[PDB]
Design a protein around this ligand. Structure first.
Ligand SMILES: CC(=O)[N+]1=CC2=C(C1)N=N/C2=N/C(=O)c1ccccc1
Lengths: 258, 301
């Protein structure tokens, strides 16, 4: 808990309200849909697994993508190009050793050129005006994990899992703030694994009450419940690993009793 | 893009390197003088360098009087230009020029005070500079000093892991890094400042190591060889050898003679061994040493 713990939290709370994408941008997209987006983010999860990239990179790339699609009409055929460039950019920003362009061109099955990917990289930087240091659900979970009295690995893994599942469905997660989704994911994971609830310390820190997190929590619980029958399965597959204590296999409570 | 470059008139190649080149340029329309950093992009055809990616996104998110200002970014097809506000000189060259006369304590205090403010601003915005050294610090004729060169800066919303090819030049490297710690923290930056603080006061570098081990030793030789009582956990660090010669803690009054009581108090807190106990930039700005701080103008050459 550095002494800038509060300063940073407060600052991330400010930033999260600005790197904010248009909640209903998909309606205005002439050719793409939420389902197409879901397939894209799912694929990026797989790419993250393949190249052993940090979870933070995945979260940053999804942020870049929603912000780009928030102000750019893209056709089915170019959507993966935007996704690839976004992933490449988040890597350069977050990873110590980012995969080389050639590797990114590789995982797209030569659907695009090294030339195309780099051009798209340039365009994405232009649209986001080089503002890549975005707040993620991931960053808030990190913050919240410190206020976890009995630090539990399974709780942290499950929260990560839930936060990652929210990245797949624009509807309804695009309408919630990262700090709020992180809050819901934390409580839900905490409850599922230890029976404990959103901690008093976090209420003071975030200003969020179990009551305020309810809306998001209701949505997240449902996503958790139906996770096994979702068309996209990359995240569950990812989280049934030893590294994550196979938390995707845990049974979600039948009721939240909120 | 090309229309913008047309409005710039080159003046003199400030410096250069691997990144690219850094010219002093003049805006033909406004007369404004800027520092133009040219980066050739075909020297890899991997897109934009990671240092550019980080310096830009992080710099254009750090607006503070004590942090160099990135005015613009021009991305052409083969080159990438970073347009910075121009400052007359860096702290390294300034220290050389002040070798004979020395830098006035009031100016030293003014500079440390400012550096601590830009640094505190960085850390409170989750940014680690990770390369605070004299040449990366810029000063102007008004007595102001600013943190610059953010090529190795990292955002730490998520812990930043220790990397071998991306570290502060040896003389300013913190002991935790030398002893092989797993992550960086804001303390690594305070340690660099502490070394620069002392270097300004004495006119000579505090720990001029020749190797990683020689560096460690010069530090042990002055601050004393750390033990579990002074730094809980040292003995259990990756590169800590029990065979380390046990030295005693030199008397600060003899290390930084020119400094008064407060000056010594602050420096010792900036050079504390346990990174968890090392003073924060925020806290440092509250030290009695800055009780009577002023903003003198330098005697630039
Ligand atoms: C490296 C960098 O990003 N910047 C360097 C400078 C910037 C921005 N703005 N002004 C700079 N001035 C100098 O570097 C300089 C140093 C000694 C003598 C003359 C000029």
């Amino acid at each position: 808990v550095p002494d800038y713990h509060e300063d940073i939290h407060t600052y991330l709370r400010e930033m999260e309200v600005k790197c904010k994408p248009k909640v209903g941008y998909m309606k205005k997209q002439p050719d793409i849909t939420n389902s197409m987006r879901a397939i894209l983010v799912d694929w990026l999860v797989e790419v993250g697994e393949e190249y052993k990239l940090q979870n933070e990179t995945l979260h940053l790339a999804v942020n870049y993508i929603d912000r780009f699609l928030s102000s750019m009409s893209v056709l089915r055929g170019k959507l993966q190009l935007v996704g690839t460039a976004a992933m490449l950019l988040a890597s350069k920003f977050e990873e110590i050793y980012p995969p080389e362009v050639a590797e990114f061109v590789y995982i797209t099955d030569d659907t695009y050129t090294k030339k195309q990917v780099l051009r798209m990289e340039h365009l994405v930087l232009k649209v986001l005006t080089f503002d890549l240091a975005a707040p993620t659900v991931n960053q808030f979970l990190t913050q919240y994990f410190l206020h976890q009295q009995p630090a539990n690995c399974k709780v942290e893994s499950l929260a990560m899992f839930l936060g990652e599942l929210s990245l797949i469905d624009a509807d309804p997660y695009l309408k919630y703030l990262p700090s709020v989704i992180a809050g819901a994911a934390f409580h839900l994971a905490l409850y599922t694994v230890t029976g404990q609830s959103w901690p008093e310390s976090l209420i003071r820190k975030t200003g969020y009450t179990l009551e305020s997190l309810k809306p998001c929590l209701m949505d997240l619980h449902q996503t958790y419940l139906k996770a096994p029958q979702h068309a996209q399965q990359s995240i569950r597959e990812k989280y049934k690993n030893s590294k994550y204590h196979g938390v995707s296999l845990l049974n979600p409570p039948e009721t939240l009793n909120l | 893009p090309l229309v913008d470059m047309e409005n710039f008139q080159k003046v003199e190649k400030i410096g250069e390197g691997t990144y690219g080149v850094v010219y002093k340029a003049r805006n033909k329309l406004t007369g404004e003088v800027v520092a133009l950093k040219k980066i050739r992009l075909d020297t890899e055809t991997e897109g934009v360098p990671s240092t550019a990616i980080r310096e830009i996104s992080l710099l254009k998110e750090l607006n503070h009087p004590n942090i160099v200002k990135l005015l613009d970014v021009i991305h052409t097809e083969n080159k990438l230009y970073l347009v910075f506000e121009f400052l007359h000189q860096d702290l390294k060259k300034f220290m050389d020029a002040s070798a004979l006369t020395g830098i006035p304590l009031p100016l030293i205090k003014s500079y440390l005070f400012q550096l601590l403010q830009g640094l505190a601003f960085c850390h409170s915005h989750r940014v680690l500079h990770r390369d605070l050294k004299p040449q990366n610090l810029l000063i102007n004729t008004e007595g102001a000093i600013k943190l610059a060169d953010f090529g190795l800066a990292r955002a730490f919303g998520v812990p930043v892991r220790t990397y071998t090819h991306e570290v502060v030049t040896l003389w300013y490297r913190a002991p935790e890094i030398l002893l092989g710690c797993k992550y960086y923290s804001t303390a690594v930056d305070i340690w660099s400042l502490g070394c620069i603080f002392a270097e300004m006061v004495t006119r000579r570098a505090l720990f001029p190591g020749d190797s990683e081990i020689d560096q460690l030793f010069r530090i042990f030789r002055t601050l004393g060889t750390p033990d579990e009582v002074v730094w809980p956990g040292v003995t259990s660090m990756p590169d800590y050898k029990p065979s380390f010669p046990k030295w005693a803690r030199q008397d600060f009054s003899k290390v930084v003679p020119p400094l008064d009581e407060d000056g010594r108090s602050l420096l010792s807190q900036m050079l504390h061994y346990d990174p968890n106990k090392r003073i924060s930039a925020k806290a440092a700005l509250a030290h009695p040493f800055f009780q009577d701080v002023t903003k003198p103008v330098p005697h630039l050459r």
